[PDB]
Structure formats: C-alpha cells, structure tokens
Scaffold this active site. Structure first.
Site, mmCIF file in Angstrom:
data_model
loop_
_atom_site.group_PDB
_atom_site.id
_atom_site.type_symbol
_atom_site.label_atom_id
_atom_site.label_comp_id
_atom_site.label_asym_id
_atom_site.label_seq_id
_atom_site.Cartn_x
_atom_site.Cartn_y
_atom_site.Cartn_z
ATOM 1 N N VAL F 49 -1.881 -3.114 -2.605
ATOM 2 C CA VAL F 49 -1.432 -1.665 -2.688
ATOM 3 C C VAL F 49 -2.474 -0.965 -1.819
ATOM 4 O O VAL F 49 -1.935 0.048 -1.055
ATOM 5 C CB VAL F 49 -1.464 -1.043 -4.245
ATOM 6 C CG1 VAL F 49 -1.473 0.487 -4.017
ATOM 7 C CG2 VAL F 49 -0.612 -1.628 -5.136
ATOM 8 N N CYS F 50 -3.489 -1.448 -1.727
ATOM 9 C CA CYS F 50 -4.760 -0.871 -0.910
ATOM 10 C C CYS F 50 -4.081 -0.604 0.756
ATOM 11 O O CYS F 50 -4.563 0.539 1.180
ATOM 12 C CB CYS F 50 -5.809 -1.533 -0.965
ATOM 13 S SG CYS F 50 -6.503 -1.895 -2.740
ATOM 14 N N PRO F 51 -3.845 -1.633 1.088
ATOM 15 C CA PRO F 51 -3.331 -1.268 2.624
ATOM 16 C C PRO F 51 -2.296 -0.403 2.850
ATOM 17 O O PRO F 51 -2.297 0.286 3.851
ATOM 18 C CB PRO F 51 -2.872 -2.654 3.168
ATOM 19 C CG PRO F 51 -2.585 -3.433 1.987
ATOM 20 C CD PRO F 51 -3.393 -2.954 0.967
ATOM 21 N N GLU F 53 -1.743 2.182 1.287
ATOM 22 C CA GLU F 53 -2.480 3.605 0.989
ATOM 23 C C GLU F 53 -3.106 3.808 2.184
ATOM 24 O O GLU F 53 -3.001 5.079 2.571
ATOM 25 C CB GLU F 53 -3.199 3.742 -0.339
ATOM 26 C CG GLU F 53 -2.369 3.659 -1.511
ATOM 27 C CD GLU F 53 -3.321 3.687 -2.687
ATOM 28 O OE1 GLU F 53 -4.213 2.987 -2.726
ATOM 29 O OE2 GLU F 53 -2.990 4.660 -3.941
ATOM 30 N N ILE F 54 -4.082 3.015 2.805
ATOM 31 C CA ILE F 54 -4.831 3.310 3.876
ATOM 32 C C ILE F 54 -4.048 3.619 5.038
ATOM 33 O O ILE F 54 -4.302 4.368 5.752
ATOM 34 C CB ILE F 54 -5.908 2.028 4.101
ATOM 35 C CG1 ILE F 54 -6.758 1.737 2.999
ATOM 36 C CG2 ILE F 54 -6.793 2.271 5.301
ATOM 37 C CD1 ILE F 54 -7.511 0.577 2.741
#
EC number: 1.11.1.24
Lengths: 197, 197, 197, 197, 197, 197, 197, 197, 197, 197
Positions: F49-51, F53-54
C-alpha cells in the site's frame, strides 16, 4: 510525650533482674496479677534524693502490702551496684537492708517504655506509676530530679483507686480513707453536694 | 512525658479564653513569666470529681499566690458552659464564685499539647503540671478519671521546687517547709545522711 | 469539602449519648430505619442563636413526627451540659423542657463525619441534614454561625422528599403540600408547564 | 462543606461564559465584589424542576438586587443550549426571557470547585451558595435532584446575613425582616430571652 | 496522546443514553457485535458545523446499514438537549427527525476514553472512529472544530476495511469499490505494479 | 490524539534526514513556518500500500504547493533504503523519481512523538497529520495497515482549513471549494440553515 | 553496559523474520541448539562496510558449517529491504545471492537485548557474538561503525572454543588449529611453558 | 557494551598502580591523551592463558608504539604479585622482563567500570578495549576464560581505526594495510564495489 | 571495625564525666592531642574480671605515660558508682586507689560509638582501642566477657605503633622494642628476610 | 562498623579455595565444628609484615592443634599466588613450606563478611578472629597495616577461652595456664580478691 505508658490502658510490660533480700531474682509485671503495683524510677544509685525515696518506701513497704500492693524501685544501675548500695550503711548515704525489690534497667528499656529516660544523661526521671491488679495503668507522677516524691500521696492514691474500684464510686479532691465518695450520676451525686456545701 | 509536655523543657505554650471573676478574658502562658503555674486539666463540666478539685484549688488559691504561683483550671468545655457552672450553687453540684481562671479548651489543643486527651471520649484526663517562672515544666501528675488529686501535695511540690530553685539544694522524700534539704555532692551530702540516720 | 456526607449516598453513621426526657440514652442512626431524620448541628450550649433553633424544633417536634420524621439536635457539648441547659429556664437563655433528643458529640466524630466542624474553634456549624427511611442523605443545609435556620423550610423539605418518594414525581420551586408536582418525562411534564405558564 | 466551598472562607473563584439578556458574556466572581451573590446550580437544561427554580429566581431577581445581591444560575450545559432554552416558551417547558445570568459550566470546573457534581451522571446537584460582598461563603444548601429549593428562604437568608453583618447581632430561628435579633453576649442577650419567653 | 483508542486493539467499550426515534434508549458497543460501527463525536448541540455532519450521516445512514455498518453520533450534551435539537427545524439550525442514534456523553467518559476531549473547553473534537464486527478499532479521524468531515470518505473507508477483511488483500490509495487491490506479498504484488505503471 | 500530537496545540517538532531530489538533506518542521504541512507516515519501504500512497502524493504535490502546503512522507526506514526504493522502477514496486521529501525515522522518534508506532512490529501506522503555517496541528488521520488513505480528502481538508483560517467561518460536512461556509454565531448562521434546508 | 549479553550466561533469546534463500522464514535461537552460532549485527542496508562483511561471511559460510557453526547476519532493516538488497547486484553495492540468513530487527529488540543499539541513530554497532551448542555466550566483539570485522578471527575463535570445549584445555594467544594448548593446572602447565620458552 | 564502556563515547576513566620497567608507578588514562590505547584485562596472575597473552603483547609492544598506540595489561592482582610474576622465568610459567605496564585492579574498580568482572569469582574476563587519542572507545573484545586473544587482530584493528581516522574512509571486512577502503557515500562507494565484484 | 570505630580514620570523639584522683572531672578525646590513648571498656562495676583489668592497667599506668600514652577505663556505670567502687578495698573486690581515669558511659554513647555494646544486656564488651597522637584509630581488641585482656600486649602494640610511626617502617610478628623492623619496599626488605632466614 | 562479625554470635560462615600441603583444597568453617579456629586476615601476598605473621603462625601450628585449635590464614590473593609465594624461599621474602592452610578471598566475600576490608585499597586489614568449637565468635583483633600481630597473645587467648569454657569461671587480666581464675558471683569471687590483694 514518649514511651507507651497510657492511663486506662495496659501498663507496659517489664522484665528485669532485681535485688530481693540481698539476692538476685528476676522480676516481671506478670508476677503481680491481682495485686496493685507502685513502680517508681530514680536516676542514679549513690546519689542524694534517691536514697531518701527508696528508704521511705522500704520503711512503709508493709503499709502497701497490707492493702495488696507491691512496691518496686528501678534505676538504670546494675544489680551489682544495687547490692553494693544496699551493703552500704544509711549513715554513709547507703540503703541498708531493703524491704522492696530494686530492679536494674541496664538496657534502659523500662525507662524508655515508661517514657522517663532523661536522654541527655541516660538516667530516669523520678517517675512513679500505679498499676492495678488487672495490669492497667491508673496514675502517672513524674518529678524533676531535685525534688523528691511523697510516700503519703502515693499511698493515698493506691487507697483511692482500690476503694473506687470495688464500690464503683469516685473520690473527691484530697480524699483519704474514711472520707465520703461521690456516686457518679446526676441524681445520686446531689447527696454529696448538699452535704458538703 | 505527655504529648509535647517534657520535664526540663519549656512547657507547651497555651492561649485560651477563660472565665476570670465572672467575665471572659484571654489567658496565655506568657502572662505568668516570672511566676510558677499549676495547670490542671479536668474532663467535663457539671460532673462529680471535677467540682471538688476546682473548688479545692479555688479555696487554696491565695496559698499558692502568696508563694508567687498562679493556679489555672482547664477542660474542653466552652467558657459559656464554665460561666453557667460558676453561676450554679455548689449545693447543687455547681462551682459558685471562683478565685482561679477556668480555661476553655474547645479546640482540644491544650489537652493535646499536654498529652492528657482521652481520645475515645474527647475529654482530658486529670493531668496537672507545675511550670516555673522561667517557663520550664517541672512536674507531671496524671490521675485516672475516678480519683481526684491532692491540693496539699500540689502545694508541697510547688514549695519544694521553689526552695530547691533558690538554694541550689535538693529536697528529700516527703520534704515540707522546715525540713532539711540535701547538698547534692558526695562530700557535703554526708551532713544530711549522718544527721538523719 | 470535608467529611463523608454525600447526597444520594448512605448518610454517615453516628452513635452518641443524648438527653431524652431528662435522662441519658444512647442514640443510633440505625434506630430510625424506615423513618425520616432531621439531624441539625449547632455550635455551643449556653449561646444565643442555638437556643432559639433548638426550642423552635422542639415546639414543632410533633409536626415532624406526624410525618414519620424524627428531629435530632447535636453539639460538641456533653450530655451533662445539655441537661444543665435543659434545666435552665428559657427566660434566662435556657432550653427548658425539651421534646427532642439532644446528642453530645464530645469526640467531634459526628461533626467531622458530617463535615460541619469549624476547625479553628472546635465547634459545629449550623449544619442540617435530612435522611430518608433508607438511611440515604437527601438534603444539606449549613448556615454560618450568625444566622439561624428556618424550621418551616425544614418541614417543607421533609414533606417534599416524602411526597416525591411516594409518587415518583418531582416538586417545583417553593412547593408546599397541595401544590402541583411535575411528572419527570418530556411528554407528561407538558401538563404542568402549559398549566402554570 | 462542598469541595473547595467552606463556610467562612473565600468562595471558590469562578469564570464562565453566560447568557445575559440573550447574548453571550463572560462572568466572574470578582465582578461582584461589594455585592452579595446567590449562586445556584441545577442539573440539566430542558428538564423539569430546573426551569421552575430558574424562573422563580428570575421573577424575583429584582427583590435581590434591591438588597445589593446578584443571582446567578449555573449548569454544565453550554451557552448555546442555555440560549435555545431561553428562546423556548415557558408553556413548553422553556425559560423565556430571563432577568438573571445563566452560566455554562461545560468544563465542570465550577461544579467540582463547589462540590456539587453528581459524578456518576456528570450533572450538578441542586446546590445554592450565598456569598457576601467580601467574597466570603456564608451559606450552603444542596437538595437531591427530585426536590426544588425555595426562593423565599434564599431571600430570607440573604436578608439575615446582611442584617447581622451591619449591626453585629445574630438572627434567631425563622428571623424575618422586622423581627428582633439577639445581642451575642451573655448580659445583653437577656433582653431577648426574657421578652420572648 | 490521551485516552485508550488504539488501532488494531479492542475499541474502548462505551455505554450511554441516546435519542433513538425521538425516544430515550440505552446504547452500548456490545449491541453492535458482528457489525461495523462509525462513531463520530461532535462538540456542542445547537452550533454550526455539527448539524451538517449529523444531518449528512443521518441522510446516508442506509448506505452504511446496507454494508452492515451502524452510524452513531455523540456529544457531551444530554439526551434532553439532543431531543430539543431534534425538535428544532433544520431551517432554524436544528436537526429535524434523525435516522441515527444521538448519544449523550454527559459524564465525558466516552470522549475521554476516545481521547477527543478538548480539556480546556469540556467538549469533544470532531473525532470519527471506525470499528469492525469484532470490536477492533480500524480507523481514527480527528478534525479541529472549524472543519467538517466527509461522509464519502467515511463510507469509502468502511468499504475498504470490509473488502480487505474478506479477501486478505490491501487497498491502494484512493481505492473505491471496483478498483484493483494488491495481494500483499513480494511475488503476487507484481501483478498490480506491472499493470498500473 | 497521538503521543504528543494534540489538536489545537503546536505540532510535535521533528528533525530527520530525508531524500530530496535524489540526495540527502536534513528536514525540520521550522523549515515550513508560514506554510501548511501534510506529514504522512507509512510502515515500510518495499511493500504494497505504501508506494501507492507515496506515488499518489508525489503526483499531486504541486496541487498542494499551489496552496502553500508542503507534503512530507516518513517511515522508520533509512535514507539509503529510501534512495534504493526511489531508484527502483514503479513497475517492480518501486517509487521512481519523487516530488516530495521522504524522511527517515530510523530512531523512531517521529513515530513515537506522533503516536503512530505499532510497537509490536516497530513500524508506523498510516498516520497523516495537517499542520498550519503557525505550527499548530489541525487534523489527525490514522488508518490500519491494510487500507490506504485518500489524497482527495487530504487536499480537501487542507483547502478547508486554509479557507476557514482566512475568512473566520466554519466549513460544513462535505465542504469543497465553491460551497458555502457558516458564520459561527447564532444569528448570522441562520443565513446558511434557511438557505440550505 | 546495556542489554543482557553476558559471557558465560545463556545468550539472549531472539526470534525474528529473516531472508533465507530468497524467501522469508522465521528464525529463532532454539533452532540452533547443539550448534555454534556466530551472530553479527551491522548498522544499515545499502551502506558500505556492511555488504563487505555480509558477503565475506556468506562466502565463508560453509567453513563454519563444516564445524557445526551457523552464521547469522542481522540489522534493523526489514526483510523487504534485505531482499531488495539481495536482489541488487554486488557491483552496484548489493549483496547478491547469500548463503547465510539475514535477520530483520525492525523492533530493535535483538539489538537492545544484545546491547549493540547505537541509540542516537537507532542502528546497531558492528557487534559479533559467538554462542555454543548449549546456548551460552562465549565471545563478544563490537567494532565502531567505520571499521569492519574479520572473518578469519571469527573462525579462529569458533575453532578455539570448540577445541577447548572438547579437550578440556585452554588455548594460548594466537592459537590456530595444530598449535599446542595448555593443561590448566599448575603441574601439567609446565609442559607448555618449558617447551615454548 | 560493558559496564560504563560505550563505543563512541569517552572510555571509562581509570587509574591504578602499575609495574613499569620493574618499578611501581601510577598509570592513568589521561597519561595517554593523543595516543591510542589497547587495554586488555586478564583474570589471574600465575595462571595459564594469561601469561601467553601478556608475553605476546609485550613482544609486539613496539609494533603498537610505532603506530602511536600504547598497550596496558590489567588484572585484579596486586603490583607485588605482578612483580613476583615478572621475576618468575617464562619457562616456569612466568612473564620475565616485560615491555608493557601491568596494572593492579585490586579494588576491582577498573574491571567493574569496563564491565568485565566475572562476579562469582571476582576476576576479569579477557576483555580488550581500543581507545583513540581523543579518549573515545572504538572497539570491544571479550573472550571467555578458556580462549586467548589474537595480538595480530588487535594490531589490525588499531591500524584500521587510525587509517579510517585520517582519511575519512571506512575499512571493509578483513582490511589490512594495503587493502582498499570505501568512500562512505552512495556515489563514491561505487568505485570500490565495481572494482571488487 | 566497630560502629564508627574504623582503623585508619579519626577515632570516634568522646566526652564523659570521669573519676580522677578521687574526684569528678570531665574528660574528652581532644585533651589527648599529641599523645597516644589506650581506651578500654569493661562491662560492669562491682563484678569480677573488670577489677583485675582495671587494677592491672592502673599498676602499669606510668609505663604507658613514660611513652606518652594515657590509659582510660570506661563502663556504662555512673561516676558515683565508680567512686564508690574505688572507695571499696581491693580485698573486698573493690578497685582501691586508681592511677587512671574511670570514665562513665551512662548514656552508652561511647559504647555505641565504638561498637562494643552488648545490646541484650546494655553493657560494654571488653573492647580496647589504641588511638595515636593525631586522633587516628590504629588498633581494635574486643574480647568476650569471660576472658580478660593483656596489658603487656597492649603496651607492646603502643610501642610498635609509635616506633613504626617515627621511622616509617613496619614491625614483624611478635616485635618488641630492640628487635628489627622491615623497610616496606621490595629491595630494602631483603635485608631483613635474608638476615632472619 | 562494617560486616557481620559480632562477639558472642555465630561467626560469619565462609568457604574458600586454599593451599594445603602445596595443593588446592576447599576449606569451610563447618570443617572445624567442635574445634577452635584462629582466622587471621592479611592484606597482600609478597609484602613484608604478612610473611612474618604467616611464618610465625605456621611454626606454631602444632601448639594450637595440641589444644584442638586450627589456624587459618587468608588474603584477597588467589590460590595460585599463594602457591607461588609458598614456592618462594623465606630468605627472598617468601613463605617456604607451610603447616597452615592459606585461603584465597578473591571475591573479597570473607573480608567483607568479617568487616576487615580496607575498601579504598581492596585489601584486608590485619584482622584476627578466634572462633570456638560451637562456631561462636569469641575475640576480635584488628591491627593497622604497619604493625604485626603476636602469636603468643593469640595462643594465650585461645587457652583462656578454652579454660573458661570448661570450668565456667572467668580469667583475669594477663591470665595464663596455671594462674587462678575467678568464680563469677558476688560470694565466690571473694576467694580470688582476698587471696590476690
């Protein structure tokens, strides 16, 4: 202000080696259940007011025993000093033969438990304590060092506490045997007040 | 040995409203610098042993005052209760006109400072204290509630403390004015012991 | 701010000697289970506002007993002082014969438990407390010393608590017997609000 | 007796937003220095007893302000709920126009400082407090929730406190304007007691 | 920073009186076992942003209930104020009839347990919390007072947490129903990364 | 509500090494005085999920900068891992060239100060924070790990806080630029409520 | 100075996710009972000295396994970062394929338990620990960050600890396989001392 | 990681009587400011591994001194025992003439401060510490009692720290004089990784 | 090793009333500056081993004074008991005339400060202490009660400490005046060792 | 002042490795139950006074064993240092062959338990302790470092304690075998006092 001696509560227990009839003997408060005890402290053996108080109580020891009350003296001196002082003639400031036990509070526990230890000198004030047959402290009397107690007053107090004990009345100021007591209730006390005023 | 009351130490200070010649007036320990004070507590007003003690000290008040000693009574009762009791005839258990102050200890601070408060009832034991002109406590006497004190013994103690104070000597047991005192050192004390034995 | 008297919680238990019909008797809170209790403190016997309050409650004693409510007065004074005050004529500032118990709180335990003790004087403020038959505190009223309470308002409060207790409604401001109460729900309360506005 | 609310001591300070003549305004106790203050708590807006107490006090606000006494109502509700209630007709359980401020104790600080917070519900009991012009608390009244207070008794107490303040006399039970007060000393008080008995 | 609300842990239990269908009812978290819950706090009744948020969630209530999610509003105002606000037309700033419960947190227990209490004012921030059918907290949203929340984002979040719960996949940024998800492991995730970049 | 993160208070200060334009540079909160800051935490580099969002925030960073808002991402990973991730193609799960700083919270101080550290795993939850130009925290958003956040909602919240900041009005639910705001007082707010209901 | 790694005592237990042959696998100390363990920490992935130490130990892994010793590498980086580093060619500063496990200490527990956490940076110093088949720590080696460790010396130590374990003798300075050991008693040690001097 | 021994921080201060060139002299850490220091503890004089280590460092002392590094040995034995051991021939297990100081940690303060005291026996483990000219601890090595240390590795470490000190580069695994170091930044480190893979 | 009595440290200061030449006289440690002191405790006066020790030291008193050493005896007995014991003939177990002071430790401060108090009996063990002319404690000798001490050994120790003091040498075992001493350094000590072996 | 050695109480238990007949052997206090024990500490092996005290007690070992008394020497030096010192000829300052055990107190436990540790140097004072067959400490002798002890006085003390042990009498000052002892009671001690005076 210090110690555990409290009126109306069990007197602080004590056990100590004493000089009884020129011999060493252990004495403890439990030995006097059922008898009144006049425990009186004094600062030092081979001094000045102390012998007059010990002698005065010894001479009248039987006046207390007739009433069922045993007299006990105690200082921080050892039983060997007590014996030596007893083996010293009264003309030389000694005690001579003694009719009461003389306890040795070498541990100072008795003086501390009774809150009479003059801490800066490690000696006991002239504290006198009256204990009843049930082991309850009834009276406290402590004098500064330069003034001696009164055997007459100590006897009067023992008498008053015994008379109020059994008859359930209260003794007025200055009461001596033969004097009226007061029935401690509003209605029955009028008898005394109307008679003596 | 009583709360803050320690012999040889400055007596616990006190300030209280009292009944004096039938009127309310403040009374402080500082009022009696340079004079002896006999402070005696009693448990309750309108009771039984208490009026006899209060009346006794009031009758003998001048005997203490001619010696420079001021007598003060105190209980936890208010000054209003004191005055009502003073206004009650002695024939009915009252006090009648008094010759000594009657202090009110409604905050129980005096009783607590002198360690005579019977905590489970909230009343002061029959504690009596002798204070010298320098404000130092010299004698402690505490009786259980049923037995009243002796004014004669209180006077004797005041006399002995005043005499020993003045002449640097010590009073033997049962000393009274006219009796011999003792020089408190090993050498000079022989004068007394040889004379009286 | 002090004590344990919390509204809605069990009233602090109390136990004390009291003067009932000229005689001393023990009074417990548990003695009044099922009955309402108006317990009112007052500072001192033989004072000025207190007799008017005690007398006023005594005159109206039956007005509360008809409702099943018992009135009790208390102060730090002893039962012996209470009795002396009762035996003092009302014209002289006394209470005269009394129709309510007069409890003695010499230990200050009741005053401290009910948080009415004036610490700097050792007397109780004019605290009044209303206790229901279940031992629950319903009302607190504390007046400063110069101003006496109102026996009428005390009766109004007892009436209101008993009525609301039985009917589950709530009494409006200034409610007195015969006045409308409010049904404490949004719908049924409209009956009162539409009527009285 | 209420949190930090102690008779004879400065009343706990407070600062809160209030609805005053339909608008929001800050109110603090220091604003009333020199005037008496009647501060009455109530549990909840849009309830039942509360509007009757608020309305009754509001109708009689001018009777208090003629005495130099200001009346203030307080509850944990916000100033927006207060205003909504003021804008609700009394016929529907509202307050209508008010002649007294209505403080918002949203932080419960006032209720906690005055020891009236019913913690298990977060609402204030029916506590009423009378504060004199010097900021000193003089009276505490707290009712359980179902019973409302009496504006008549609150006004009587304000009058009594202001009268005893000015003249140095004490008001007896049930005292109302025009009645006799007592001179609080033994001699001068006899005037009252013989007149009224 | 305060409270006990922690993501991935059992949501703080709560229990409060609420307005449900114009009547009062007890509501507690345990009532919603097996269902998702959106619990949103708001500061004050009869204010400005709050009614729009309440109205929005009320209008969208069935969108949430169709997913097995119940929506609850709460503020520190009482249920009586909640009902008076519900009985105010939305044109005049009221809520009108509602399709969601409105909880009363008068004790501030809920607000404190969820760490949204603005201590210096006693009101709750605009805190929204999403709880799953197991009672576990999944999402925390807290807005400062002047900015309202988004119901669309709240619905999207509930949809996301429910979809990822069922399929063990994770929802990328901005995910909505119909969007691709990521299988959360190094190998399988390449499917999403290679397609969407 | 997060560690030291309190709404309406100065946001917790932070100082961290960051990757900016492919190089290492220290970044601190004071660098953004006068600018809004969106600080968003994410658990781990090289995850799922992190990439998304970034990358989403990077693709829209200039949309925030046009408003004077600077976006900042942060995780417990080091700057060397950040840089390796930036140099990984997005097809393979990498970030590729970024247009926002990527801070390294290797000491976990930022995550602890902002109350988002998942202690049992040592990684930061999906916590997002909005800070105004005066350093005051305005909004808290924290998602559980499997559900990504919404850049659309983050932008809307930034737009709403700047608008309310500038015009002193409050934004209602679902507010977007161009919609009406509410003047936050009782009278002026009627304009909005009557117009929209 | 910090942690629990004490020579002669059971090594601190550890349990972490690791990269083993390009896949994630749990790894615990208990897995290695009966085997020697060389546990070496390093600060950060994608740095400089670390890859040379991880590669050196990897290339020499079989030399330790032929002795029954397992080599473990650990840093605070996640397993996803480890794998990305393994999937990075050695020419570009990567690790390439490894023959040893690479543990992830994201919670920093392993680094804290072994007292090698450089607190001010949140990374582990170059700590190396040798554990015996019984789980007892036998050797501690910690280098400052800029100086790499020696695989040769780590192998010599494992050999020496196994030989001395096996034969009950002690190895002198610089001992390598084939060299003499010392019989650790006064008499038998003379064999070595006379021969080597 | 030993008592007060923290890498990167000033090494624990030490002072102790030592044997230097056959005589007793005080040796303290401050004597070596500006020079490197290798401080190695050993358990007991007149034992087995210890002489070989002491002799090994003594013979190589000038190898360290040519580098600006001084070597010190220390045990809990007194300086008199150190001297006796020095005066014992090496063939008999003695040290013979010594080119390094031998400190006496009779108070165990040095062993405790460096966290090498085997408490159950009162002796120091084989702890070696490298301190730079700034007084900063750079390296820790602690062997269990049976296995001796490597003077070769100690020299290599000193050489590595002095080299990295002067050139601002970092030494890879197994570095020795002549081998390449790494420029510790992302870009410049590529030179090394490409040349060596 | 004795309460505050510690070898090599200033001896516990003391101050007590003592018997000297048949008269009372304060004695304090400061009076003996520049002179050695032999302070020996004994349990009780009028006992058994004590007089034999006290007499023995008194008979040898001048042997100590010729060396510049003063001998002091002390028990917890008072100075009045001491004098009485001195005035008892030796044949009767008394002390007869003494040539050494006899200090009184009735406060037990000296016995407590020198750690020789037999707590269970309140008497001092047979503790002897040697203090130099600088007030430093040099020797401690404590015997159980049934075994007396040796004046010869006490004298021998005073001579040994004085001799070693003035020449900076050390006295072997059993040393006596006239015998050889040792130069306490390795080289010069060989003179003694070769001569006597 | 430190430790746990108290006259008349059980000697502190101890266990240590010792050199016995040129070999290592465990020694403990229980080994000597029923035998008298002379335990003497000395500061350091290879010094000056210590060897002369060890040799003196060794040469006289049988003189003590004939009485059933065992002599133990102890310092903080290890057994390996003890043995090296024993293997050093007496002419060179060594001990040569010994006839007494030499205990090793490397942990300082014995010295600490016996309160003879000179803490600032980590060595034991010249403390000698006589323990009877029942493990009770009978005598304490502590000498400052520069003065050796006397074996003759030690032997004398052991004889006196054994004689007094068996015959229930007390030995006067300077008692040696063949001299008279004292019957410790007032009546029987006269036998000794009249004969010897």
């Amino acid at each position: 202000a210090s110690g555990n001696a409290r009126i109306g509560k069990p007197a602080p227990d004590f056990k100590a080696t004493a000089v009884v009839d020129g011999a060493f003997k252990e004495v403890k408060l439990s030995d006097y259940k059922g008898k009144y005890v006049v425990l009186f402290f004094y600062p030092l053996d081979f001094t000045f007011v102390c012998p007059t108080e010990i002698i005065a109580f010894s001479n009248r020891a039987e006046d207390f025993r007739k009433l069922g009350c045993e007299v006990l003296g105690v200082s921080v001196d050892s039983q060997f000093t007590h014996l030596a002082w007893i083996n010293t003639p009264r003309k030389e400031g000694g005690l001579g033969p003694l009719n009461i036990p003389l306890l040795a509070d070498v541990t100072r526990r008795l003086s501390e438990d009774y809150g009479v230890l003059k801490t800066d000198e490690g000696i006991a004030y002239r504290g006198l304590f009256i204990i009843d047959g049930k082991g309850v402290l009834r009276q406290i009397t402590v004098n500064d060092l330069p003034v001696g107690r009164s055997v007459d007053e100590a006897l009067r107090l023992v008498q008053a506490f015994q008379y109020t004990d059994e008859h359930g009345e209260v003794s007025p100021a200055g009461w001596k045997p033969g004097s009226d007591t007061i029935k401690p209730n509003v209605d029955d006390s009028k008898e005394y007040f109307s008679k003596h005023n």
